[PDB]
Every structure is written in structure tokens, then in C-alpha cells.
A paper describes a structure:
Hsh49p, comprising two RRMs, forms a heterodimer with Cus1p. The structures show that the Cus1 fragment binds to the α-helical surface of Hsh49p RRM1, opposite the four-stranded β-sheet, leaving the canonical RNA-binding surface available to bind RNA. Hsh49p binds the 5′ end region of U2 snRNA via RRM1.
The Hsh49p–Cus1(290–368)p construct yielded small needle-like trigonal crystals, which diffracted to a maximum resolution of 2.7 Å, but at this point we were unable to solve the structure by molecular replacement or isomorphous replacement, partly due to twinning. All four molecules in the asymmetric unit are very similar with average overall RMSDs for the main chain of 0.22 Å for RRM1 and 0.42 Å for Cus1(290–368)p. The higher resolution crystal structure of RRM1–Cus1(290–368)p was used for the detailed analysis of the structure of Cus1(290–368)p and the interface between RRM1 and Cus1(290–368)p. The Cus1(290–368) domain is folded with most secondary structure elements located at its periphery, and it covers almost the entire α-helical side of RRM1. An extensive interface is created between Cus1(290–368)p and the α-helical surface of RRM1 of Hsh49p. At the center of this interaction surface, a completely conserved tryptophan (Trp312), located at the bottom of α2 of Cus1(290–368)p, lies flat in a hydrophobic cleft on the surface of RRM1 created by α1, α2, and the extended linker between α2 and β4. The buried surface area of the interface is about 960 Å2 with a complex formation significance score of one, implying that this interface plays an essential role in complex formation (PDBe PISA [Krissinel and Henrick 2007]). The Hsh49p RRM1–Cus1(290-368)p structure fits well into cryo-EM density of the Bact spliceosome, corroborating the biological relevance of our crystal structure.
Numbering used by the authors:
A (entry chain A): 8 to 86
B (entry chain E): 289 to 350
The structure:
Amino acid sequence: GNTVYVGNIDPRITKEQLYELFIQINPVLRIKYPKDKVLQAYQGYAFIEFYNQGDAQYAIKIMNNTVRLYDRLIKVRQV
Amino acid sequence: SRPGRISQELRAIMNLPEGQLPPWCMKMKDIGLPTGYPDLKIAGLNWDITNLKGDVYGKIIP
């Protein structure tokens, strides 16, 4: 319940950029940002862990379809 | 990194010039301020809009 799924992420985006963005919305505990280790390429999605379920739910409501990174509209969903 | 400021690097990526409220502004007016930052003040919401200056749009003010 404390983790959200973030999608439509341009592979140029860094974990530190995702952190700067999402700490605007609530405190962030950790980010899991899957990478193909053979190609060292991000895969278009991430998991952002907030400190509790309320804070995650708030983030989904505020951020889904709200921000474009490299012109791509970011999706935020419960997972 | 901190709530209420956005770096030049992230601003370029977001297409958010200095002096403009971030795009979640309207939704925060509807839903409320961050559940996890009780003392966050955002320019144009619960902080004077004249504080929307440079890379700053909000500040934690206890």
C-alpha cells in the first residue's frame, strides 16, 4: 500500500531526478528503478515507496497524468 | 533536493521555467497540501504568490 508505480519514463531519466520530483509531493523512503544490467538501460517505469499508504494515495491522486518529463506524460498508479 | 525548490536540471526536463507554478498546482488546490508536509507553504495557495521567485515555489515554514 505504500508503493506506487510510475510509468512512461524516458530512459534518460535518473533515479535522483525521480526523487527530486516525487519529494515535492510527499516524503520518499526509497525508489526501485529497474535496469537491464547488460545494456545499463532503464525500462520506462519505477516503484516509489512512500512512508505510509495515505501519502502514497495522495501522490497517485496528485501526480497521475500531471507532469511531462521529456514531453512524455507520467502515469502514477497503485500497486 | 527539497520540497518547494526545483533544480535547473529537472526544470529543463519538466519544461518548467523559473517563476511558474508546477503543474500539480491545480490538483493541490483541489485535494489539499501534502499529507506528509504539514508545514509546507506553496506560493499562490497558502503562501503569498510573490514568493514564486526563481527556482522556489514553496517552503517548509513551522
